[PDB]
């Protein structure tokens, strides 16, 4: 009764997720401006987020009838191909806010460091570090199925090893939440500084209420990032915090906060392309 109303939202997030995101895969691969730094990064944050949405219905079958209809090596790879695409969809998100830093805050000294040759070395290294972070999940993919018979897709540990949920699960804060947040909220706090600095003092303009009209389009990028990723992250730390009996509020909202954490990869096509004017005239014109 309670699992059924959110089993559908695992699909319709992935329905609009796999739809709008592969639209952005189409236009950079087909239309103009494929050789620029904004489009080489928004392609790699769209491959990483379309290959992230595929691991959602394998969790949707587990949500209502609590049993995985797989488990030999299929439940081991859906904790890896969805594993890599978590830490490379928010690492291609923190390097696209470094790109926007060097384009705006250092427009002269960093014109020579933003070529489309050092972009391909970064985007290859973005996918490379993503294996070197999830590698505990690639090793320990065991299935706990002894509670009267229920096929799970979870992650095992050497022995039981309760430091998996205190340890590894805060290892994915010091490289999964906080470090991509303390760069994105730090790069954008210098763009607002550099916009107010140049247009006022040295190049005298009068259009200077855009300095507040760039904040309202950049406070939203960090607003979706906490709202998608830390109702989920406060729940997984709450394993140590007096784990209680499951109920349709505990077992319902916990399947909702990991349903909420895939909504970041549905905003990334619309908050990086469909709110930019170079996709409003490249893709939205036709």
């Amino acid at each position: 009764t309670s699992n059924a109303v959110l089993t559908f939202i695992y699909f319709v997030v992935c329905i609009i997720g796999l739809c709008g995101n592969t639209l952005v895969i189409y236009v950079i691969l087909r239309y103009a401006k494929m050789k620029t730094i904004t489009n080489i990064y928004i392609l790699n944050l769209a491959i990483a987020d379309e290959l992230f949405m595929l691991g959602l219905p394998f969790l949707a079958m587990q949500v209502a009838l609590v049993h995985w209809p797989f488990g030999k090596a299929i439940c081991r790879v859906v904790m890896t191909v969805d594993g890599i695409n978590q830490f490379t969809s928010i690492f291609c998100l923190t390097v696209m806010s470094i790109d926007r830093y060097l384009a705006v805050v250092h427009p002269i000294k960093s014109a020579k460091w933003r070529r489309p040759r050092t972009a391909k070395m970064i985007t290859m290294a973005v996918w490379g570090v993503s294996l070197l972070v999830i590698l505990p999940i690639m090793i320990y993919a065991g299935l706990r199925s002894n509670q009267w018979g229920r096929s799970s897709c979870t992650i095992n540990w050497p022995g039981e090893s309760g430091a998996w949920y205190t340890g590894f699960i805060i290892y994915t804060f010091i490289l999964g939440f906080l470090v991509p947040l303390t760069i994105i909220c730090l790069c954008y706090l210098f763009i607002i500084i550099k916009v107010k600095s140049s247009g006022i003092r040295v190049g005298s303009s009068k259009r200077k209420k855009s300095e507040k009209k760039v904040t309202r389009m950049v406070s939203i990028v960090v607003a979706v990032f906490i709202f998608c990723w830390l109702p989920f992250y406060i729940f997984n730390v709450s394993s140590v915090s007096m784990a209680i009996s499951p109920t349709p509020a505990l077992k319902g909202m916990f399947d909702f906060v990991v349903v909420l954490t895939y909504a970041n990869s549905c905003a990334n096509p619309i908050l990086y392309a469909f709110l930019s004017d170079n996709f409003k005239k490249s893709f939205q014109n036709v």
């Binding site: 979870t154 998996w164 709450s238």
Partner: peptide, 12 residues
């Protein structure tokens, strides 16, 4: 029963 882990609602 580990009601809170990575992306599963395992065993309970």
């Amino acid at each position: 029963c580990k009601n809170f882990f990575w992306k599963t609602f395992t065993s309970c």
